């Protein structure tokens, strides 16, 4: 295969004219020594914003279930929303209130929202407040029968 064959030389480019000007050279004269780095890049761990930490403190509905079910077993009677407010004044206040309404709707015992009953509650740093609530029957058997997945 490597045998040459008699074929014409067409497009015969001359090339690589050996002119001394074509000489350039290695120039390590640029004797740099680039950055070595192995530092352990730990940093401040807490800077991240607030709502992140609010979720870091988000309410747990299961412990709230424990509290409310114990409260309703103790009461052994239907309990309206304001009554719950004074019975166990929550810190995650309207959170527990919305969850309580969801319970009453999940629990079946009568739920009504056509009236205004009020309760005053203090938050996690004591700063106190007032609320406006409907009445509804929260009771031990109802919530106990229902599960709170």
């Amino acid at each position: 295969r490597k045998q040459e064959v008699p074929l014409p030389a067409v497009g015969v480019a001359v090339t690589g004219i050996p002119a001394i000007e074509r000489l350039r050279f290695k120039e390590v004269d640029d004797e740099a020594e680039q950055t070595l780095d192995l530092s352990n890049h730990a940093a401040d761990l807490t800077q991240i914003g607030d709502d992140f930490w609010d979720a870091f403190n988000g309410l747990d509905r299961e412990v709230l279930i424990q509290q409310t079910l114990q409260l309703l077993a103790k009461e052994n009677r239907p309990v309206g929303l304001a009554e719950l407010a004074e019975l166990l004044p929550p810190a995650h206040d309207l959170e527990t209130f919305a969850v309580w309404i969801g319970m009453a709707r999940e629990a079946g015992i009568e739920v009504i929202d056509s009236q205004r009953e009020f309760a005053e509650l203090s938050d996690g740093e004591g700063r106190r407040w007032r609320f406006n609530l409907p009445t509804t029957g929260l009771e031990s058997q109802a919530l106990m029968d229902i599960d709170w997945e």
Binding site: D37, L38, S39, N40, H41, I48, G49, F52
Partner: protein
Amino acid sequence: MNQVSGLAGKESFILTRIELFNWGGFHGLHQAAIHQDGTAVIGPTGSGKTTLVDALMTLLLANPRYNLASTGGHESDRDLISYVRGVSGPGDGGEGQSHI
């Protein structure tokens, strides 16, 4: 909740470590370890988390569906080149929008 540790460790290999340097949205040398019995990774939305997930997948395929955590299940704005160079063009948005 957390206590099904039984089968782990014995039969299979279990991922608890990472070693990093000048990768993706990170810079310089970093390290970490996973808890052999279950772990989570947390941080601000856009806290390099997706990129750190990529850092694993790059060792475990020919070609990953890059940036997949932030970019769900499709071709993404970021690739090996960007992570290597640290490019964050779409992110900074008003600094140089390449920030290499």
